Design a binder for these strands. Structure first.
Lengths: 135, 138
DNA sequence: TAACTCAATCGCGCGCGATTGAGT
DNA sequence: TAACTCAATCGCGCGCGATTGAGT
């Protein structure tokens, strides 16, 4: 029973924390016209560009069920280019525009202008949950 | 130097983003058989501690509001877990009450979750970050 | 021909900023 | 008439189990 009461106040605690972060980021990002999930996508591109949809998904643990309609929105909003690979026409290559590439500094400033062992505790629970789900 | 602090905040959005997802995945897997979602399970946890309650009260406990809870208490009512009824005293208010079935099924649910499960130190680190972030938003 | 691997699509339930309109 | 406080509603963007259909 007590091991349940521990598990329950961890779903709940992690459930609050990700919501509050998401709130905090969307507050600052509102002015650029992008969401936090789009921001995450843009963080992966800012590190490695171009990338395939599949590659971005692997970085974020997401798939095309999320990333297909969401890269579209980033394209419509001028941050990225979606185009088919000639080499393999099933694949989809996501490339930053110049405007997408350029605004990184502006975005990072907006966020920045508004805990050493914590990160370890998350990264470990992340791992513990990943084995509990799979197999 | 500011850039290093950003990288830290980015790999915490992301790390808590992954952890919340995985827990939801885990609790949906186990709760599938009872025909409830994890968010409904959360609502049910507060009723199991205190019943009845108003929609507003539940929302205070989970930091949610009617925009989420209104359509979601309707699903739990349709599924037989709760009653939704107007307060005679104050007809703006909406009182949530567990059914017998919703009350009685607690043990069954907990068992289903329990049987698939030092980590107390961890709970303190989350609770604190929660509290840092709450003040950061206001 | 088939097996395989992709993004795209479908259905649903959140979360949440914002607004509405009933009720006190 | 007003101020105030509720659940309900609206619109949108996720997340994700599941399926589809184009391409290799």
């Amino acid at each position: 029973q007590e091991q349940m009461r521990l598990a329950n106040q961890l779903c709940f605690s992690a459930y609050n924390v990700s919501r509050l972060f998401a709130q905090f980021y969307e507050k600052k990002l509102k002015q650029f016209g992008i969401t936090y999930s789009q921001y995450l996508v843009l963080l992966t591109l800012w590190e490695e560009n171009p990338q395939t949809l599949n590659s971005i998904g692997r970085h974020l643990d997401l798939s095309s069920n999320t990333l297909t309609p969401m890269l579209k929105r980033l394209e419509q909003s001028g941050w990225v280019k979606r185009e088919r690979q000639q080499s393999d026409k099933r694949q989809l290559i996501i490339t930053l525009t110049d405007n997408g590439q350029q605004q990184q500094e502006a975005v990072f400033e907006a966020i920045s202008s508004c805990y050493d062992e914590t990160k370890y505790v998350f990264e470990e629970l992340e791992q513990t949950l990943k084995h509990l789900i799979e197999k």
